[PDB]
Amino acid sequence: GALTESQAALVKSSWEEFNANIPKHTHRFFILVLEIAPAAKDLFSFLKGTSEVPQNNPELQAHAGKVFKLVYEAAIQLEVTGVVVTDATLKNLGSVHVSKGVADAHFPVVKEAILKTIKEVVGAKWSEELNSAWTIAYDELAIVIKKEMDDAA
Ligand code: HEM
Ligand SMILES: [F-]
């Protein structure tokens, strides 16, 4: 699909819609994760020793917000520039995943959890053109982090 001026316009628009409700979209996102893979729970400090996914845990919200922002920034960068740029942050990201016991096969878990989360976020405006656009942007960003984990291990 490439990332036409028209496709980028579509991701920006849909991320603005996501940020618009962090405590919801982020707790949803963690539930979609634990649905696709239950075992994932022991990983998260703020999920350990608990039984259910905490709903007002600042640690949890701050965490999940950061995740989506990063995927959107990635899509704009693709339309303007044609690429996703690797910086200090993406590199430190790779380190912390590894400390915490996260692997590659965990990534389609968090992807589907994000496509499903955005399909839920944009509702009837959903188009093939839009699905195509977030898919392109995640894929392109995951490619970059997975790269940095391998390097932190
Ligand atoms: C493009 C996709 C992804 C992005 C942009 C991303 C981003 C991040 C960021 C920014 C942090 C640190 C947050 C903080 O300091 O507060 C973090 C921590 C973490 N992430 Fe990810 N992530 C991605 C995929 C994944 C996957 C697939 C898993 C595995 C299930 C995972 C598991 C974790 C864990 C266990 C921590 C440590 C949390 C702690 O115990 O406090 N992430 N991630
Ligand atoms: F994460």
Curated annotation (Swiss-Prot):
Entry keyword set: Cytoplasm, Heme, Iron, Metal-binding, Nitration, Nitrogen fixation, Nodulation, Nucleus, Oxygen transport, Phosphoprotein, Transport
Single GO term (MF): oxygen carrier activity
Family, per entry: Belongs to the plant globin family.
Globin domain: residues covered: 2-150
PANTHER family reported in the protein's UniProt record: LEGHEMOGLOBIN-RELATED (PTHR22924), NON-SYMBIOTIC HEMOGLOBIN 2 (PTHR22924:SF92)
SUPFAM superfamilies: Globin-like
Modification note: Nitrated in effective nodules and particularly in hypoxic conditions; this mechanism may play a protective role in the symbiosis by buffering toxic peroxynitrite NO(2)(-). Nitration level decrease during nodule senescence. Phosphorylation at Ser-45 disrupts the molecular environment of its porphyrin ring oxygen binding pocket, thus leading to a reduced oxygen consumption and to the delivery of oxygen O(2) to symbiosomes.
Localization (cell): Cytoplasm, Cytosol; Nucleus
Summary of the function given for this chain in its UniProt record: Leghemoglobin that reversibly binds oxygen O(2) through a pentacoordinated heme iron. In root nodules, facilitates the diffusion of oxygen to the bacteroids while preventing the bacterial nitrogenase from being inactivated by buffering dioxygen, nitric oxide and carbon monoxide, and promoting the formation of reactive oxygen species (ROS, e.g. H(2)O(2)). This role is essential for symbiotic nitrogen fixation (SNF).
Residues involved in heme b binding: 45, 66, 97, 100
PROSITE patterns: GLOBIN (PS01033), PLANT_GLOBIN (PS00208)
Upregulating conditions: Repressed by nitrate in a dose-dependent manner.
A single Gene Ontology CC term: cytosol
Tissue specificity note: Root nodules.
Protein name in UniProt: Leghemoglobin-2
Gene Ontology biological process terms in this record: nodulation; response to nitrate
Gene3D superfamilies: Globins (1.10.490.10)
Superkingdom of origin: Eukaryota
Subunit structure: Monomer.
Nitrated tyrosine, modified sites: 138
Modification Phosphoserine occurs at: 45
Annotated binding of O2, by residue: 63
Major site of localization recorded for this protein: cytoplasm
Entry keyword Signal: no
